[PDB]
């Protein structure tokens, strides 16, 4: 819901347009999902689109990957409708001498819904030319690429200032920098956030970044506590776990949203969390979050089984070590996962008459034998292949390992 | 010169954007020259531009190469000025379901000067979607990509029909196909030219070897239909922009040549041009326009044995040491004339600057009848000694003996 003073912003990140392009079963999952996002922006009639990073899965995208993206952008963001937003901030900052203006302030190209985006870890600039994929879409006039970080050492963060009606919005951008280093430049107070002064209080402050939320390494993440308190809300990028619901941080005073990716780039429970995007509507200094679930997302089910401690395997396996029987018991489990995988899809698409894809099934297993009670793990490729035509991950169904090193 | 019934067309080919991108001296020659082309189209106020192919030197252009092309296209081909051309042909035949219309018949993108291009050998399609670099420029709305050849075996060639005022023009296009194969499909009459009526000016653009080293690797002019009026040759880099007439066939043939030198041979040494092609009724007018941003290049061929200047010393006397100074004097006279050409050509106008370091090439076959052998010096070393005087620092001279 929105009026002339409410700004409808659509949030999404880590689309990774290019993931599993060469996979026969799951090739189009990458771009077809992204195109759904762009159609919603036109459908929900948002005022803009904000992307968090990792738009491409590859640093140097394929021609097909770049095509599908270009195709979706032109169809959904070009039109006759006028943009109700005003560009107050300095264009010269983060807009080069090629086309110093914003794309929708361009005379020869009519942009109905402007798109802003930062570069992620995969999207990041590279090569002797030092350009990223977003610069190409920007010189195409399709996208607006802000939050450039030229010097990792010395960092100045200047805002993009936009206003709709009586509502003023300060937009902060900071693309991906290697987690281990960006951890230290913050500590040394090397980063300075630039502020408008005249209407400084009224500004709703919004920031989007692309770092590890929490790290496996002790230095490879970015702690929330290091960000300024004046900020109102933060969009977390590099994380693929859909936590679109805004938690409030006590010490800092702002809320944090973690949209997660658009498709599963890894078969872990974090990627199993149902993926959404949010219709973020900003009014005055208050925001309204309307989360919207994705339909084109491939069904994904994952479970964890410790064969030794399992309720079913305890008897047959310690005594006998009968490999062929290990299958049948495991066969029954995988078939119950596929069963629920199809039901979720069935239920979710009961709603509308738009009309199913072969689901994703993952099992992770450790087996322990104290005294030659060894479970026999079949050859990884062989077990997975037997479900050819029932799952999308024909080769990658199950993982086997032991936790003693 | 042109009125409402004269169609000004800018003709260019083999821009090879991406050539020597990684060369410290000559990295920018690739795109800055192509930008000159585009600015001319806006400057000369042509009605359209026609590219012969090989726009990119690489099949997968780097991000910088694609950016500089996209930049030149947006700046010169988008504007408020209307296009005086009308699209009569079927949009469906050459435009996909993505954007079935021509780029300047697009509602949300204002195109001032439309670009038509075929794909060359380097520019050719590859990969999953069978897409090339032109498909991206087309979906960006910057280029119209026509003359796709889906089947090399069976070839149907349908024309793009365009009309300005009382002047009607049928635009035929054929993308580059392998020279050895396309030679045989033509022989089997596998290719059919579709036809529209009026006295249409028929125009064809292709991207093949004019003459070949192999006996099967070229395309003879004598195989194409006779109704056509003019032909643009798009794979040959030698600049023969002057339209020769073919007696048997009855049409004229133009060979614009490349935009920069992809090879250091006398063919690429020929001063490079583009042509302001003015079509009125069934008559064409050609105004060739020389390129200023092209690097000075000088090449010569020296056969040491037969060379009159030195004879006795090099045969029977001690070699290696003295030979340098003799060759040194010659290469400096080439650098001398290279700089002069540039000076004379740029004297004309106040470009207000300094001139680029020229390209110098020497080729040497050295024969020795009877142990009279000249003593040659290591390729890298001799070339490197002109660091700062030439652009080609590590490859100035070619030494060889003919017989194998
Ligand atoms: Mn990431
Ligand atoms: Mn070429
Ligand atoms: Mn060629």
Curated annotation (Swiss-Prot), chain A:
* Residues the entry annotates as binding Mn(2+) 1: 14, 16, 54, 240
User: Which Gene Ontology MF annotations are present?
Assistant: 3'-5'-DNA exonuclease activity; manganese ion binding; single-stranded DNA endodeoxyribonuclease activity
Report the principal subcellular site: nucleus
UniProt KW Glycoprotein keyword: no
Task: Name a GO CC annotation attached to this entry.
Answer: chromosome, telomeric region
- Under which EC number(s) is this enzyme classified? 3.1.-.-
Active-site feature positions: 122 (proton donor)
Please provide the record's keywords in A-Z order: Chromosome, DNA damage, DNA repair, Endonuclease, Exonuclease, Hydrolase, Manganese, Meiosis, Metal-binding, Nuclease, Nucleus, Telomere
Q: Can you tell me which residues bind Mn(2+) 2?
A: 54, 121, 210, 238
Q: State whether keyword DNA repair applies.
A: yes
Biological process terms in GO annotation? double-strand break repair via homologous recombination; double-strand break repair via nonhomologous end joining; meiotic DNA double-strand break formation; mitochondrial double-strand break repair via homologous recombination; mitotic G2 DNA damage checkpoint signaling; mitotic intra-S DNA damage checkpoint signaling; telomere maintenance
Q: Where does the protein end up?
A: Nucleus; Chromosome, Telomere; Chromosome
Assembly and binders = Component of the MRN complex composed of two heterodimers RAD50 and MRE11 associated with a single NBS1.
Record family assignment: Belongs to the MRE11/RAD32 family.
Recorded protein name is: Double-strand break repair protein MRE11
Q: Which organism encodes this protein?
A: Chaetomium thermophilum (strain DSM 1495 / CBS 144.50 / IMI 039719) (Thermochaetoides thermophila)
């Amino acid at each position: 819901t929105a009026g002339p003073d409410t700004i409808r912003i659509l949030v999404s990140t880590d689309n990774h347009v290019g993931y599993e392009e060469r996979d026969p079963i799951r090739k189009d999952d990458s771009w077809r999902t992204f195109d759904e996002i762009m159609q919603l922006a036109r459908t929900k009639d948002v005022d803009m689109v904000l992307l968090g990073g990792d738009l491409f899965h590859d640093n140097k995208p394929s021609r097909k990957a770049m095509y599908q993206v270009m195709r979706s952008l032109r169809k959904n963001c070009l039109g006759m409708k006028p943009c109700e937003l005003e560009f107050l901030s300095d264009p010269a900052e983060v807009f080069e001498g090629a086309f110093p203006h914003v794309n929708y302030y361009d005379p020869d190209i009519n942009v109905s819904i402007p798109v802003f985006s930062i570069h992620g870890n995969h999207d990041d600039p590279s090569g002797d030319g030092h350009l990223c994929s977003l610069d190409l879409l920007q010189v195409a006039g399709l996208v607006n690429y802000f939050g450039r970080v030229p010097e990792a050492d010395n960092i100045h963060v200047k805002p993009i200032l936009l206003q709709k009606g009586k509502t003023k919005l300060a937009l902060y951008g900071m693309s991906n920098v290697r987690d281990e280093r960006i951890h230290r430049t913050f500590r040394d107070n090397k980063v300075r956030f630039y502020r408008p002064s005249q209407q400084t209080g009224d500004w709703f402050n919004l920031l989007t970044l692309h770092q590890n939320h929490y790290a496996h390494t002790p230095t490879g993440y970015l702690s929330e506590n290091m960000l300024p308190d004046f900020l109102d809300l933060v969009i977390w990028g590099h994380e693929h776990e859909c936590l679109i619901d805004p938690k409030k941080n006590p010490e800092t005073g702002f809320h944090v949203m973690q949209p997660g990716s658009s498709i599963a780039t890894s078969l872990v429970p974090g990627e199993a969390v149902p993926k959404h995007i949010a219709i973020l509507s900003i009014t005055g200094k208050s925001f309204e979050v309307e989360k919207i679930p994705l339909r084109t997302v491939r069904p994904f089910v994952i479970r964890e089984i410790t064969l030794a401690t399992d309720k079913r395997f305890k008897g047959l396996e310690k005594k006998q070590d009968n490999r062929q029987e290990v299958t049948k018991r495991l066969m029954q489990i995988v078939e119950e996962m596929i069963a629920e995988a199809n039901e979720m899809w069935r239920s979710l698409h009961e709603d509308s008459q738009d009309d199913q894809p072969l689901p994703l099934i993952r099992l992770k297993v450790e087996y322990s034998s104290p005294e030659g009670t060894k479970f026999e793990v079949e050859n990884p490729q062989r077990f997975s292949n037997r479900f050819a035509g029932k799952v999308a991950n024909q080769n990658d169904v199950v993982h086997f390992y032991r936790k003693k090193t």
